[PDB]
Amino acid sequence: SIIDQNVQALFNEISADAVFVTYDGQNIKKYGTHLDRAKTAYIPASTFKIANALIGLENHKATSTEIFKWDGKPRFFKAWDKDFTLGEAMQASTVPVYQELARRIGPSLMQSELQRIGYGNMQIGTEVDQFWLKGPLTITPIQEVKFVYDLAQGQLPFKPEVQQQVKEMLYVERRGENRLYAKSGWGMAVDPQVGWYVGFVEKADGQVVAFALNMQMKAGDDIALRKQLSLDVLDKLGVFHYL
Numbered sequence: 001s002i003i004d005q006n007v008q009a010l011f012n013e014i015s016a017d018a019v020f021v022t023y024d025g026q027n028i029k030k031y032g033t034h035l036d037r038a039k040t041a042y043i044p045a046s047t048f049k050i051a052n053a054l055i056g057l058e059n060h061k062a063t064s065t066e067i068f069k070w071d072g073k074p075r076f077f078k079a080w081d082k083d084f085t086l087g088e089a090m091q092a093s094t095v096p097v098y099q100e101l102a103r104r105i106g107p108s109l110m111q112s113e114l115q116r117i118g119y120g121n122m123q124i125g126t127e128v129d130q131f132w133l134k135g136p137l138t139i140t141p142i143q144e145v146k147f148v149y150d151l152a153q154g155q156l157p158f159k160p161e162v163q164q165q166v167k168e169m170l171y172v173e174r175r176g177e178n179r180l181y182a183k184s185g186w187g188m189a190v191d192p193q194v195g196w197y198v199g200f201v202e203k204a205d206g207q208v209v210a211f212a213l214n215m216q217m218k219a220g221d222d223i224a225l226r227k228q229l230s231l232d233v234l235d236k237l238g239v240f241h242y243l
């Protein structure tokens with residue numbers, strides 16, 4: 001319809017290859033400039049923090065209350081040089097905290113758990129704190145959107161209290177009683193770079209619309225574009241109107 005055309009017209013000014021997938025529990029829908037991205041596997045990058053938190057809370061390797069203290073070594077980013085709960089680190093996307101969480105899980109458990117839940121190609125390689133950053137773990141946008149849809153509904157194979165804790169770590173904003181949850185990612189260690197904005201909108205209706213923006217990135221690109229483009233799309237779709 002015209003709203004489909006409204007959404008496609010947003011991408012006609014985006015020069016990068018991009019797909020935007022939505023999932024409402026019945027139908028997958030695809031928008032953007034390169035629709036085959038939706039069935040292509042990319043590294044999860046920072047969106048893997050969702051599965052990381054779930055696995056780590058599920059297996060008694062952290063709680064949502066524990067402080068991950070900074071060990072005094074200046075990190076790549078400076079605003080990471082502080083203490084973090086898992087939730088505070090989710091919003092700050094603090095990779096060293098989630099690397100430490102991966103090391104608490106260990107390669108053996110991490111592997112069996114990715115297999116158990118069927119996350120992407122379920123491949124971890126030999127370095128337990130790098131596989132979502134460099135490969136070999138990859139996942140398609142359609143797999144992400146179905147992953148987080150189930151998270152929204154409490155239907156992933158984890159304890160419901162664990163899903164609820166991780167779900168609220170992703171809380172972004174609400175408009176009336178519609179709630180946006182989302183996690184961004186920018187995998188810079190691979191060629192080509194991959195950009196993600198994945199999440200879901202929970203309506204007061206209880207209905208959920210999960211979404212995944214996935215696009216080619218290159219150095220110097222606007223870090224705010226992924227989020228701003230996704231909110232534009234969600235507004236044009238009528239899933240998450242601007243106020």
Ligand SMILES: *C(=O)[C@H]([C@@H](C)O)[C@@]1(C)CC(S[C@@H]2CN[C@H](C(=O)N(C)C)C2)=C(C(=O)O)N1
Nearest residue numbers: 045046047077093095133184185186187223
């Ligand atoms: C996650 O996908 C990614 C890596 C480190 O795992 C992460 C957390 C980095 C970035 S943006 C990058 C780090 N901070 C820089 C910055 O803000 N400026 C202005 C220099 C750029 C993201 C992201 O999603 O934006 N994810």
